[PDB]
């Protein structure tokens, strides 16, 4: 989760993008924007002579 600069409308909250996943949320208590983007991916490489 990361703090956001986005400005929702007073009732809006999803992170739906081009693919429609989630990169936005509002604290049900402090009502602030928390961008979501996971900590992972994948690619592998070993070099040998």
């Amino acid at each position: 989760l990361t703090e956001s600069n986005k400005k929702f409308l007073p009732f809006q909250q999803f992170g739906r993008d081009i693919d429609d996943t989630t990169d936005a949320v509002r604290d049900p208590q402090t009502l602030e924007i928390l961008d979501i983007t996971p900590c992972s991916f994948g690619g592998v490489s070993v070099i040998t002579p």
Binding site: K7, F8, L9, Q12
Partner: protein
């Protein structure tokens, strides 16, 4: 009596009915909806939504 004399005054109200259609919507930088097109009115709109 309770059933005859009374004043209405000028007002007029409009009533419509809805229909299951398909719409194409245009949101902006604020995410506020700014425009739309009913691509079942005319061919040019159909081209737009396709």
């Amino acid at each position: 009596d309770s059933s005859s004399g009374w004043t209405a005054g000028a007002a007029a109200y409009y009533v419509g009915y809805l229909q299951p259609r398909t719409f194409l919507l245009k949101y902006n930088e604020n995410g506020t909806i700014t425009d739309a097109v009913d691509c079942a009115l005319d061919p040019l709109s159909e081209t737009k939504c396709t």
